[PDB]
Symmetry: D2
Subunit: 351 residues, 4 copies
């Protein structure tokens, strides 16, 4: 019942200011933190060798897009490797990102691990030496981080243990980050896999987020200095019943309104497999939803921002312009979407 301030007023101000700049009106996040193993399949989808130079060239392609993306990109999440690479002109990538008005982010978790005694459920590791890593990343230009936990809707999942454990590890990660001037993006992703319907996803999301915020509270997390990266509430991939973007928006916004304290600076949705256009339309519908929303509702897209660019590039240098144009187009669409101003041209009691 006694307070022992985890953060000073100055530390809180820095964390809060960073969080707000990332999700400022019209801005979202480019999630380009795919690891070597993760970026492997993506590079082969266009028949390109998975070398460090090709990964540098590709990341450079996205980060050096023209000034049209500047007002669209509030932040860029990078993988460790990319944080220390440089553009052709010799500029460190984080410098490139900042010069264009973006805040630099760094993925810091070390992947999921199986939870014994569960039906294929996992938790996420990466807390060991995390404080030292955050201190170093901060010094090297990063101001926010990302940690991904994965939950799955199934027969007996997410289980009580999976929910409690993932919620608890996120809080620890958030706690260590804030001690080092790093704004933590809390990502409790509920996979869309399965034949469950919209209300099932909404129910689970509601229970997951309630657990997440109780954990953050127990660990004394400064919410104004954090961001939330949740899945949108949608039916399962194999769901037979069809839903409109308006229903997906209502279910998503309702789930958030029932669990996310208004103190949380912003919600940056993951695209989780949605097509580029689908992810944009949904985000737009979410922002159009006729319910009060006390936090910024924007994007933190990986696939939803890179699909076309990757394809347009094909691993050929001559395609650089064509590839960047594709990325710029998605950046613009989503910039409008997080403001509910997107257009193809450019009963809540039932929830």
């Amino acid at each position: 019942p006694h307070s022992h301030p985890a953060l000073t007023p100055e530390q809180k101000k820095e964390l809060s200011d960073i969080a707000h700049r990332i999700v400022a009106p019209g801005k979202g996040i480019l999630a380009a933190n795919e690891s070597t193993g993760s970026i492997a399949k993506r590079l082969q989808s266009i028949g390109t060798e998975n070398t460090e130079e090709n990964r540098r060239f590709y990341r450079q392609l996205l980060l050096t897009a023209d000034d049209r993306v500047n007002p669209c990109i509030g932040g860029v999440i990078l993988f460790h490797e990319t944080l220390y690479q440089k553009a052709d002109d010799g500029r460190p990538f984080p410098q490139v990102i900042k010069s264009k008005g973006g805040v630099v982010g760094i993925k810091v978790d070390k992947g999921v691990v199986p939870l014994a005694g569960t039906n294929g459920e996992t938790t996420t590791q990466g807390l060991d030496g995390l404080s030292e890593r955050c201190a170093q990343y901060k010094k090297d230009g990063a101001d926010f981080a990302k940690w991904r936990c994965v939950l799955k809707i199934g027969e007996h999942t997410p289980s009580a243990l999976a929910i409690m454990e993932n919620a608890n590890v996120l809080a620890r990660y958030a706690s260590i980050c804030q001690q080092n001037g790093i704004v933590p993006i809390v990502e409790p992703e509920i996979l869309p896999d399965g034949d469950h319907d919209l209300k099932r996803c909404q129910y689970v999301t509601e229970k997951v987020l309630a657990a997440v915020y109780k954990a953050l509270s127990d660990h004394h997390i400064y919410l104004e200095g954090t961001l939330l990266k949740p899945n949108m509430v949608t039916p399962g991939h194999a769901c037979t019943q069809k839903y409109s973007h308006e229903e997906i928006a209502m279910a998503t916004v309702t789930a958030l309104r029932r669990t996310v304290p208004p103190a949380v600076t912003g919600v940056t949705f993951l695209s989780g497999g949605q097509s580029e256009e689908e992810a944009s339309i949904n985000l737009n519908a979410i922002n159009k939803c006729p319910l009060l929303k006390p936090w910024a509702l924007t994007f933190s897209y990986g696939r939803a921002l890179q699909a076309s660019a990757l394809k347009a590039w094909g691993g050929k240098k001559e395609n650089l312009k064509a590839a960047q144009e594709e990325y710029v187009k998605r950046a613009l669409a989503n910039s409008l979407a997080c403001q509910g101003k997107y257009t193809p041209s450019g009963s809540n009691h039932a929830y």
Copy 2:
């Protein structure tokens, strides 16, 4: 991880509509649910015998004030006895309240009890047969209820047990209420007793509300069909350090923003021993706080709406008009306060 809908879309609508009517813009709650015991000292101070007729008369005095209070009062909380009494014109009090555009509320808890193994901490009882009681109160005109839990800031309080237990019982009470079409006002009051400062009260308030909402989630409570009746965040009653109404407002709004989901329809502050003017001024500063507030921030005052009316009445029938006049003045003042339109005459530090 499986849903078994506690409420149908129809029941949700009913609860949500009720909650919104109670806290509609510029409206607040008159808490006149004092038991014979708590009202005892009130009437005693004014040398008035605590009879059933005197209590009926006094309640009548408040409930029948002129229409000027209509836009100020969204709801009135009554004690069992009063829910079944009638005004001089034969009109039962619930009807009197409704005809004035107010929703009828009923106190349902059965008081605090001691938690063994704690330093004077308590939990609250009253769950036994609560479902049948709610169904009957609903039939008799009540659309919302009140249940009060009490927590205290001390050397070792509130303890983990007290927070968890009080949070859990509030959830049980809320669950049973919603099953009977009654909007539950969740009241986790943290007493102002003690010499702790503003930051301490904010800390404890944040921890208690986080516990309350996690409990309500575990029990499948429909937040849109509930109201929150918390203490404002203020320094202890005996704190040597002094603060401004703006600091109290900032502390209060910050604590709420960090713990109360936007889905909660409204927050109805208890006065907790504050003077009538102080309660209105703080409520005003709260609504003027330069932070986003996704819920109505109004009042559910007992003492802060009756202090002057009770003294003006003095137990004399010929002082009826004068007594009501004082109540109206406080109703008007607070109606303006919950909108930030009342005039008596660096948030990172929180």
Copy 3:
């Protein structure tokens, strides 16, 4: 992190002494606490009008059984009504029970209530005014009490809410009891209904008991002054796989060993629908189980001690001695069973 003794050394000794007397070697509990409604079916099966007189006579029949039951019965659980009734010779039933060497117990819960948002799950009510009731019961002869929570094994049950809520209410009941010199029998019954197998029951029993004891710890419960009344670990009633009594014993003892602290004075198993002979044979196997058991493993049988007696009686006073003989036989059988001396004539797999 700071202690505020819920009990004094004297209060502890009293509770521990009572708890130990009830489960002394060779002794068990006769659960005769059926309410008018729960005993209705039983009386109907024998075409006997459910009147206070017939109930009084039936209870008298059991309580006045000959001295052979004395070393078999350490305690007797009564329903409120019976605690205040007298034998034909005028002796109050509590006095009759005590004159035969038994401790008097009383049921104090007020039945189960539905938990909104769950698949037919429940919690139990009865805390309101419990302290006052316990003090009164203590004064009137009772030294221990019983409170029944009910959980069910199903596709989604018991849920996290049900397990948590039932464990918490059991802890509240336990605390209140100990504050009044009453030994609480904690009964978290997991129904045998369903087609689940033995390992499913064991898993669920382990999870429920782990929850029960964490709750008792959180509420500062003096374990040495309590008793546990759990279900034995068995397959569901509709399960098609067959098991031996040795397997039921191994699963039951393994589950208890993994969750019940050694400090718990005793485990008094409910018969939960098992026949008289089955309940005795299982209790026997449980006591002969190779594993080390730090607590007494006896009975707290209702149906398993009355089946044959109720039938031999048929509501006919002429069958008094025939009926009592049946009860006496089961009392003797179970006394031997709780010692592993009854005869009707790879633990890593758990």
Copy 4:
């Protein structure tokens, strides 16, 4: 509410068999898993240079004591470095340990880290890549592991958060260990630091253990395949009120009886700064405590088994036999203590009476 067996019957048998061998009647654990930074002051006190060779030598001194310790030592906890060192004869230490009938253990936690927002409280790290580390350690001779969590008694500690977080990480560590055939020793140490009395320590120990076992249940831990390494229940090191060995034993056994499920195979007490003689005497009293104890109550001493040895060695190779003799003496005494058959005479020596307490 549905089961998904974390372990097969075979895995359970292997884990249970290991746990029982470590705490078999009369047997205890030698805790020699001090890190270079930890064993630094130890070697410093005896003017011994903290080199890898000196550490290797000192560990060999303990591990190669004569056969009299065989019946006394059920297990030996080692530090990563030592697990891969060899004795003068070329034999890997794990083999030396096994040849003497002991089980090899390995310390796997990566130390304590501060819990933000608390009054100097910590949690412990070391879960990253623990699964792979355990599989490797297993292949290299280790059959059990140790992970240390540290809690402190104070005005506001241990806090609800510290208790919950530490109990949770211990459970994660135990879950990963059991998945790799490694028996985890759960160590939730409540420091003796402070002026609190006996009942205060008992109260805190009871709350901490209840939290630890609830977490272990939540994480589906096989208790029979685990060991508990707790602090004995004693007054604070600065407490004015004095207590007898019988009272300490009573408080300790009572705390354990109210929280530790009978399924737990054994409790291996940490000496926590107690002198060698004090640790042995208390363990003896604990085993003679009248109350029923469904689990083996033995030792897992670090300081309490090495105090006299270190002093007798002094870094001098010529004092090998002298040093080992002191170790053997403490091992024999504790072997009897964990059987409630220890009765000091007066020859222990001033080194076995010195307070091995170290503030934090």
